[PDB]
């Protein structure tokens, strides 16, 4: 039942289109806004915000990013063929992972800033969250990705595989996911071969790196939630609670 060369070429096109339609911010917009940087006054504003308010803002923005990943999944060839259980298992495990990868587009390695609420700012913007080590990990991961200089098509094909990972515990139709994963691998490898970029394969993040960053995020969320349980109830998006609570 395996896929022809034509089907694989179609799959490259399909995956790239799905990403294009759901990437949330356009790369050209992000790049052209690099000179727009939060002033010292604005940074001070952020640092003076309360821990709970900063956490609620970041949860909102993450949730919005996650909704775009869900849309990506829905437009991905063969996602709709998965049973409902496995769709949830894959997204619960992978959505945040995809967001962490997508973040490199919004990260400027020249001055170590990220696009956030309309301007570029460094890690210090996030001081009020009270989780410097997590922030540092996130910026380090974005920095490692910046060095690969992913194309948009590469980001598309790689994030597809981050999502369609047959090793998630709990999948009920493992074999179907293995087949979808394999074909997505063929598409990614085909694209790389045609563009003479197979050398990136050896440079991709080590297997459980993404898992580590996500596990740290959940731990910090649990510590927050433990310290401020009513804030999470009253002001975090329902989707965020379902994903992470």
């Amino acid at each position: 039942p395996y896929a022809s060369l034509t089907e694989i070429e179609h799959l490259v096109q399909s995956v790239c289109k799905s990403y294009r339609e759901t990437c949330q911010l356009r790369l050209e917009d992000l790049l052209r806004q690099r000179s727009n940087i939060f002033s010292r006054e604005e940074v001070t504003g952020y640092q003076r915000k309360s821990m709970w308010e900063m956490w609620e803002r970041c949860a909102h923005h993450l949730t919005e990013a996650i909704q775009y990943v869900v849309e990506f999944a829905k437009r991905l060839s063969g996602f709709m063929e998965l049973c409902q259980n496995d769709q949830i298992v894959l997204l619960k495990a992978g959505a945040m992972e995809v967001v962490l990868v997508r973040m490199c587009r919004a990260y400027n390695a020249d001055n170590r800033t990220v696009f956030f609420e309309g301007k570029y700012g460094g890690m210090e913007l996030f001081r009020a969250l009270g989780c410097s080590e997590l922030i540092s990990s996130i910026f380090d991961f974005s920095h490692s990705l910046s060095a690969l200089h992913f194309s948009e098509d590469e980001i598309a094909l790689y994030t597809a595989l981050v999502l369609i990972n047959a090793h998630r515990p709990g999948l009920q139709e493992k074999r179907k996911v293995e087949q979808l994963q394999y074909n997505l691998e063929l598409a990614f490898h085909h694209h790389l071969c045609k563009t003479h970029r197979q050398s990136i394969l050896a440079k991709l993040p080590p297997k459980g790196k993404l898992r580590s960053l996500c596990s740290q995020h959940v731990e910090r969320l649990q510590i927050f939630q433990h310290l401020h349980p009513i804030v999470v109830q009253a002001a975090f998006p329902p989707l965020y609670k379902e994903l992470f609570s």
Partner: peptide, 11 residues
């Protein structure tokens, strides 16, 4: 146990 997630998947 995932009503908002199913709602998005259904939209």
């Amino acid at each position: 146990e995932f009503p908002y997630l199913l709602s998005l998947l259904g939209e």
